[PDB]
A paper describes a structure:
PPARs belong to the nuclear receptor superfamily and the ligand-activated transcription factors; they exist in three subtypes in mammals (namely, PPARα, PPARβ/δ, and PPARγ) with considerable amino acid identity (54–71% in humans). The ligand-bound activated forms of PPARs are stabilized by associations with specific coactivators, thereby enabling the regulation of specific gene expression. The carboxylic groups of the PPAR ligands are known to stabilize the AF-2 helix 12 through hydrogen bonds (red dotted lines) and electrostatic interactions (blue dotted lines) with the four surrounding consensus amino acids: Ser280/Tyr314/His440/Tyr464 in PPARα-LBD, Thr253/His287/His413/Tyr437 in PPARδ-LBD, and Ser289/His323/His449/Tyr473 in PPARγ-LBD. When compared to the LBPs of other nuclear receptors that have 600–1100 Å3 cavities, the LBPs of PPARα/δ/γ have relatively large (1300–1440 Å3) cavities that are able to accept 1–4 ligand molecules.
Residue numbers in the entry:
A (entry chain A): 201 to 477
B (entry chain B): 603 to 612
Write the structure that this text describes.
């Protein structure tokens, strides 16, 4: 049976440190995102993009961070969307990298191993956190100023219409677990510290930290989800689904490569995907 | 190589 001893009090201190570091690393938390998704907010109320006419008008009324008046934009809706998403991804790599450095012990890992953990973990974190911004109708965009429907994304010409749908599929199942930010902060730390990433050199200290994180997560979930006996194992299984999501997303990307020319990933994304798997 | 990722980490 569970008890309140110096070990558990260390696990909780660890969980709170991750949470605090997570709130200041990631702008739109799932708390704020779900308020928006229910109107339970003041703030703004996002502009809904649900068809081509609302898209055109949304680009005008939403202040997209990456857009300037004006660089050269694709003129084709699907590609302009790809470009915004690629920009958000690059941003997210930096958010996640910063968060990684806040994970006790991470910075003192082999610098080359730090690189490898981020290379493999970043897109699994991206899709993990993207679910915070999704419901079954669509996904929050642009820091929550816009909302793009699932069916609009699905209606983009092939193969762009196939990019987001596997993420929605994942998000429906994953959000039915009802994690909050406090859960998520530990779960993404666990993902970053996967001691089975290809090419790791000094695996021992990585498993040590991941061990300490897996304990802090199990305690976290027992305390925070009284009505969910099998939550810890269900969550670990979701790391399996995320690797599959990343695999599938890679296969669509190479469709883009030998098909859409002019398109090219931001070099940060190119280093990540290069020799991924 | 992962030059940008290396740069971000240092
Ligand atoms: O692969 C990359 O990292 C660059 C390309 C990534 C990417 C291109 C792309 C094009 C379309 Cl039409 C739909 C989804 C797409 N995705 S995504 O599903 O991965 C993604 C990522 C972060 C994000 N923030 C709010 S929505 C969102 C969607």
């Amino acid at each position: 049976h569970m008890q309140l001893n110096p070990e558990s009090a260390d696990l909780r201190a660890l969980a709170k440190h991750l949470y605090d570091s997570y709130i200041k690393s990631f702008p739109l938390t799932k708390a704020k995102a779900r308020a928006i998704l229910t109107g339970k907010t003041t703030d703004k109320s996002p502009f809904v993009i649900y068809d081509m006419n609302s898209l055109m008008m949304g680009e005008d009324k939403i202040k997209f961070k990456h857009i300037t008046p004006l660089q050269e934009q694709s003129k084709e809706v699907a590609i302009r969307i790809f470009q915004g998403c690629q920009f958000r991804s690059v941003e997210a790599v930096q958010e996640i990298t910063e968060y990684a450095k806040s994970i006790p012990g991470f910075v003192n890992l082999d610098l080359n191993d730090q690189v490898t953990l981020l290379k493999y973990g970043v897109h699994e974190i991206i899709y993990t956190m993207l679910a915070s911004l999704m419901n079954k109708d669509g996904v929050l965009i642009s820091e929550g100023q816009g909302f793009m429907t699932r069916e609009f994304l699905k209606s983009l010409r092939k193969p762009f219409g196939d990019f987001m749908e596997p993420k929605f599929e994942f998000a429906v199942k994953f959000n039915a677990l009802e994690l909050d930010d406090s859960d998520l902060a530990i779960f993404i730390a666990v993902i970053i510290l996967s001691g089975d990433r290809p090419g790791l050199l000094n695996v021992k200290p990585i498993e040590d930290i991941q061990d300490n994180l897996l304990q802090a997560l199990e305690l976290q979930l027992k305390l925070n989800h009284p009505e969910s006996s099998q939550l810890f194992a269900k969550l670990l299984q979701k790391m399996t689904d995320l690797r599959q999501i990343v695999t599938e997303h890679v296969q669509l990307l190479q469709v883009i490569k030998k098909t859409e020319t002019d398109m090219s990933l931001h070099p940060l994304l190119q280093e990540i995907y290069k020799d991924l798997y | 190589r992962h030059k940008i990722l290396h740069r971000l980490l240092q």
